[PDB]
Amino acid sequence: GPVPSRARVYTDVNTHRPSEYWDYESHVVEWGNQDDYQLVRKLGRGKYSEVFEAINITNNEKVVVKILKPVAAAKIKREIKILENLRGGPNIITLADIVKDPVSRTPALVFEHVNNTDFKQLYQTLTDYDIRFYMYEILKALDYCHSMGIMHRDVKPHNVMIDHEHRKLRLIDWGLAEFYHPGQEYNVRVASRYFKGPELLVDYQMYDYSLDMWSLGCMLASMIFRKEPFFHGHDNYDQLVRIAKVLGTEDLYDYIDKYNIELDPRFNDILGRHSRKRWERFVHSENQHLVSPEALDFLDKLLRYDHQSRLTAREAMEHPYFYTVVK
Numbered sequence: 001g002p003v004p005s006r007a008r009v010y011t012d013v014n015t016h017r018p019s020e021y022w023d024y025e026s027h028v029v030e031w032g033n034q035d036d037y038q039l040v041r042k043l044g045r046g047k048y049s050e051v052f053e054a055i056n057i058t059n060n061e062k063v064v065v066k067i068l069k070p071v072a073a074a075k076i077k078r079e080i081k082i083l084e085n086l087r088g089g090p091n092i093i094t095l096a097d098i099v100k101d102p103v104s105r106t107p108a109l110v111f112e113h114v115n116n117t118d119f120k121q122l123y124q125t126l127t128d129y130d131i132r133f134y135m136y137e138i139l140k141a142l143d144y145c146h147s148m149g150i151m152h153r154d155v156k157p158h159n160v161m162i163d164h165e166h167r168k169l170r171l172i173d174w175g176l177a178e179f180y181h182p183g184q185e186y187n188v189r190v191a192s193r194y195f196k197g198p199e200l201l202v203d204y205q206m207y208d209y210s211l212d213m214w215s216l217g218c219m220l221a222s223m224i225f226r227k228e229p230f231f232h233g234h235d236n237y238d239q240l241v242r243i244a245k246v247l248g249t250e251d252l253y254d255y256i257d258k259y260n261i262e263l264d265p266r267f268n269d270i271l272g273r274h275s276r277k278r279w280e281r282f283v284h285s286e287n288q289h290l291v292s293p294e295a296l297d298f299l300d301k302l303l304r305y306d307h308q309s310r311l312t313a314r315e316a317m318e319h320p321y322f323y324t325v326v327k
């Protein structure tokens with residue numbers, strides 16, 4: 001069967017802390033007052049919630065209200081416990097309150113409001129300096145949650161709010177987040193397709209915080225190369241083939257061999273044989289201003305098949321790519 005794996009950092013976080021820290025099922029929710037909030041406009045709806053802009057009438061402040069759709073009671077308590085555990089952490093969205101919505105009869109999570117700058121505007125105009133600056137801010141959020149024994153598992157651009165005017169960033173939507181317990185087998189049906197780590201794509205369940213570092217590398221590659229998304233799979237199988245056309249099939253086979261993973265036989269007809277490509281292949285006159293030897297070296301250290309070989313968030317923060325960032 002598969003060779004077991006454990007993170008190379010923060011393995012003992014959930015053993016050192018008390019059971020009440022990670023046993024989200026035993027957590028008792030402290031309910032706020034729904035009457036303190038007035039919904040202003042619907043901002044969006046995903047598979048698990050409807051999101052609104054609202055006002056806290058007790059202090060007249062703007063808030064964001066996430067009304068959860070009826071789902072397994074386990075997923076709800078998990079998100080709340082993770083949000084409370086991480087509250088106050090650098091660049092972590094602040095959970096301000098939990099109320100029972102009178103209409104849905106489900107919990108409604110109230111967050112601090114972030115004036116999110118238009119995604120297209122950010123993607124099209126952030127500078128090389130700005131990309132390094134915001135990447136450093138995301139790393140502060142990731143190292144903080146990992147150090148707190150939690151993996152986000154849904155790192156993608158739509159989960160990173162940026163108020164560019166105030167140079168403020170928040171990592172949001174902790175609905176797919178989980179506590180990391182060494183030896184635990186997790187569900188591989190996490191993260192959005194283009195951000196899924198090879199571990200998920202080859203159905204290796206004993207993954208860890210390093211999955212977030214792969215997703216972070218996908219975001220960086222898309223930004224600096226002006227290719228959105230970087231690995232553009234038509235499905236979860238074609239997603240692995242798209243990665244293999246860049247990183248090569250020989251390192252893919254070394255990875256699955258290391259962990260005694262057998263690829264799903266449906267890959268026989270679609271994978272093929274691909275050499276590893278040099279990152280300079282993706283450089284051109286329309287993205288050269290965002291590329292540097294430091295950027296390519298950093299990307300190379302995130303986008304590795306072997307989850308145990310990727311930079312951790314804390315190691316990533318001392319990479320030369322961030323030397324130019326004012327600290």
Ligand SMILES: CCc1ccccc1-c1c(Cl)cc(CN)cc1Cl
Nearest residue numbers: 119122123131134157158160219223
């Ligand atoms: C393209 C992702 C990216 C890579 C590097 C620096 C910033 C970003 C980024 C992020 Cl994280 C969030 C948003 C807004 N949701 C926009 C952008 Cl441009």
